[PDB]
Design an enzyme around this catalytic site. Structure first.
Site, short mmCIF file in Angstrom:
data_model
loop_
_atom_site.label_atom_id
_atom_site.label_comp_id
_atom_site.label_asym_id
_atom_site.label_seq_id
_atom_site.Cartn_x
_atom_site.Cartn_y
_atom_site.Cartn_z
N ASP A 176 -16.44 95.25 -56.29
CA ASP A 176 -17.02 94.82 -57.57
C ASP A 176 -18.32 94.07 -57.34
OD1 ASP A 176 -16.92 92.64 -60.15
OD2 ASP A 176 -16.37 94.72 -60.62
N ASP B 10 -12.81 97.15 -50.80
CA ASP B 10 -11.98 96.09 -51.34
C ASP B 10 -10.79 96.81 -51.99
OD1 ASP B 10 -11.04 93.61 -52.37
OD2 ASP B 10 -13.10 92.88 -52.50
N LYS C 50 -14.88 87.49 -47.26
CA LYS C 50 -15.13 88.92 -47.25
C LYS C 50 -16.41 89.29 -46.53
CE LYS C 50 -12.41 89.88 -51.42
NZ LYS C 50 -12.54 90.39 -52.81
N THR D 80 -8.45 92.86 -48.24
CA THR D 80 -7.74 92.43 -49.42
C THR D 80 -7.31 90.99 -49.24
OG1 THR D 80 -5.87 92.89 -50.94
CG2 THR D 80 -5.47 93.29 -48.58
N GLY D 81 -7.18 90.26 -50.35
CA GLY D 81 -6.52 88.97 -50.33
C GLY D 81 -5.01 89.05 -50.36
#
Length: 261
Positions: free
Chosen positions: A209, A15, A191, A163-164
């Site tokens: 995370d 991420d 994701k 990634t966003g």
């Protein structure tokens, strides 16, 4: 058995935000147009000293990093939808957004396009109504990340990112790091599906995370929660890294390849 099966990993997906990058804005470039870069930063930070906007704060922080004292600004004004303005050295300066530069019909140097193409946030400094320079900012790549990737590639692991963030930012990070693949505009609930897509070819790790990215870590063959700290136990990830150093992923795989239990 997570440490044990790390040896069989073939792909690692990070991420992006906070893991490969700092997770906050930082100045990447200062570009003066017949105007010194140090002066540009000092003036811009002087004008942005009282702002609460994260981009303004990052500009101020870069002046702190370089040890530049700020100047008292005369006739200060904050203009929503534009930026800020002040008199410094008997000249009228502004720090403004590209939106405002467009609304004023102000032409911009063709060089600035390269920064926009990296997905950087660009701030314009005007001096008496003319563009004096630009400051570009990004969610900067962690010092450790290039080595984290290079170590993984050295042991044959495909290095990927999701990634966003938009595709310009994603491409920029991917190119700086030499990633094998990347996925942009990935929303939180999407994701896990990207991990599954990579698993169509590879025994795959997800690094992120443990709280926010729980589903993707669970989908992975090895879910690595990074920067977990020592307060909130991450009960659900396979391996939890207390600190936030992406080079530890290669360290896990390399040691696993030397060992069994």
């Amino acid at each position: 058995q997570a440490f044990e099966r790390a040896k069989d990993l073939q792909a690692v997906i990070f991420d992006k935000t906070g893991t490969l990058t700092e997770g906050r804005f930082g100045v990447t470039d200062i570009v003066g147009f017949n105007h010194s870069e140090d002066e540009l930063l000092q003036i811009a930070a002087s004008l942005e000293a009282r702002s609460e906007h994260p981009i303004a704060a990052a500009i101020v922080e870069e002046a702190e990093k370089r040890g530049f004292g700020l100047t008292e600004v005369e006739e200060f004004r904050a203009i929503p939808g534009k930026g800020v303005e002040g008199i410094v050295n008997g000249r009228r300066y502004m720090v403004v957004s590209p939106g405002y530069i467009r609304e004023l019909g102000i032409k911009t140097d063709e060089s600035v396009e390269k920064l926009k193409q990296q997905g950087k946030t660009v701030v314009f400094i005007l001096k008496n109504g003319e563009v004096s320079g630009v400051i570009a900012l990004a969610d900067r790549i962690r010092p450790e990340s290039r080595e984290a990737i290079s170590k993984l590639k050295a042991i044959g692991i495909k290095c990927m990112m999701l990634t966003g963030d938009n595709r310009f930012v994603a491409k920029w990070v991917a190119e700086e790091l030499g990633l094998d693949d990347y996925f942009a505009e990935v929303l939180p609930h999407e994701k896990a599906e990207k991990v599954k897509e990579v698993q169509q070819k590879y025994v795959t790790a997800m690094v992120g995370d443990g709280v926010n990215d729980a589903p993707a870590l669970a989908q992975a063959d090895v879910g690595i929660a990074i920067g977990a700290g020592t307060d909130v136990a991450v009960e659900t990830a396979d391996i939890v890294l207390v600190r936030n150093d992406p080079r530890d992923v290669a360290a896990i795989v390399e040691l696993s390849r030397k060992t069994y239990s």
